Amino acid sequence: RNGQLLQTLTGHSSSVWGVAFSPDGQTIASASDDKTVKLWNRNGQLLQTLTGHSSSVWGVAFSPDGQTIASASDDKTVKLWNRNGQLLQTLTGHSSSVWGVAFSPDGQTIASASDDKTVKLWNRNGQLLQTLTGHSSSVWGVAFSPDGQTIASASDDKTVKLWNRNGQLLQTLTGH
Amino acid sequence: WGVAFSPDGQTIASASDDKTVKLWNRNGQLLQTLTGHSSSVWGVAFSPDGQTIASASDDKTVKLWNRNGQLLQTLTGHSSSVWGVAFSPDGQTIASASDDKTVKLWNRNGQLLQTLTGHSSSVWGVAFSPDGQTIASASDDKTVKLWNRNGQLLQTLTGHSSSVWGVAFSPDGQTIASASDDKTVKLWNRNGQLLQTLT
């Protein structure tokens, strides 16, 4: 199934988060060079353009059911979109570029990874639930455990950290 | 299944319904079409330098191509569908994982170097260690196996309760991560010992 967590546990600072494939494998989403996210099918047919961010989009993810898309931007926000292109929510609270984003397995929680050295957890109504503090540099990747109760973050500080939903730091994995 | 993106992030590959692999830029324009496979492509990988593409197919072959579309080699030797492909960190060795229960290792000039025999069911995934000397395979048989390049089996990592679909090494090469349909990720050392389970 989803390789985000393997990639966050073992991947490099340079791992690329601006392309995502839908869970059914039929749709590709790409953070494009024009402040949009574009969706296309495997034949190459353009399906949708997600317009709203005011600067570069760096991270994209699909919800586990494929119906919601999250985009992470240099504009310091995450935006949530329906696959028909409508903007559903803007998640405000990071203080710098947002590099990466992930959905929880149940689709109800969003995690974001920012240049501000934090991961933030959010619900779909756009409310901030938790801020995970401790990395000493920009956070480039984030993922959930398969049961959705542990969050993994990966940072330019060369560590991976494991956290629970109440913000407790469970483990730091060093040499990354 | 049948998608990849280049290490620099600027090229997206995807297997198409028509048995080709398409390469797109990040704006959804077509760059190249890789034509040659006679049935579905299940696995695509880019080499670390981003200059070579490997495709794994139901036609029992892996094809190697350059990024302007030219077929370079066809890797013939699996006896059933090839599900996964990986390149070694130096780009010189390719590993392929097949429904035939084997991993095969190949030079980028197409020669079969080794066949890694031991799994009792389909092999879904394969990875090289950062130093290129150890291969890990993830199988439907619920194990990850670790191998050297001479094809010798070094360890079998036992503990997942369902098929293992994904495997990778930590950046320092001393920890192996496995992901399974049992809804866990396990971390292991090279002596095959379980370090932790992530639910």
Author numbering:
A (entry chain B): 32 to 207
B (entry chain A): 7 to 205
Provide text from the study:
Many folds, spanning all levels of complexity (fibrous, solenoid, toroid, and globular), clearly originated in this way. The units are arranged radially, with their strands perpendicular to the plane of the toroid, and have a right-handed twist, hence the name ‘propeller’ for the fold and ‘blades’ for the repetitive units. Since none of our single-bladed PkwA constructs were folded, we turned our attention to another highly symmetric β-propeller of the WD40 family, found in the C-terminal part of Npun_R6612 from the multicellular cyanobacterium Nostoc punctiforme PCC 73102 and referred to henceforth as WRAP (WD40-family Recently Amplified Propeller; ACC84870.1). WRAP, which we identified during a systematic bioinformatic survey of β-propellers, was particularly interesting in that its 14 blades are practically identical, having acquired only 10 point mutations over 563 residues (6 of these being Trp → Arg mutations at the same position of blades 1, 3, 6, 10, 12, and 13), as a result of 13 non-synonymous substitutions at the DNA level.
The 5-bladed fragment, however, did not form a 10-bladed propeller, even though it was dimeric, as observed in solution. Rather, the dimer adopted an unusual, asymmetric structure, hitherto unseen in natural proteins, in which one monomer formed the expected 5 blades of an incomplete propeller, while the other monomer formed only four blades and converted part of the N-terminal fifth blade to a helix, leaving the rest of this blade unstructured. The blades in one monomer were antiparallel to the blades in the other, as opposed to natural propellers, where the blades are always parallel. As the stretch of sequence preceding the helix was not resolved in the structure, we analyzed the intactness of the crystallized protein and found that it had undergone partial trimming during crystallization.
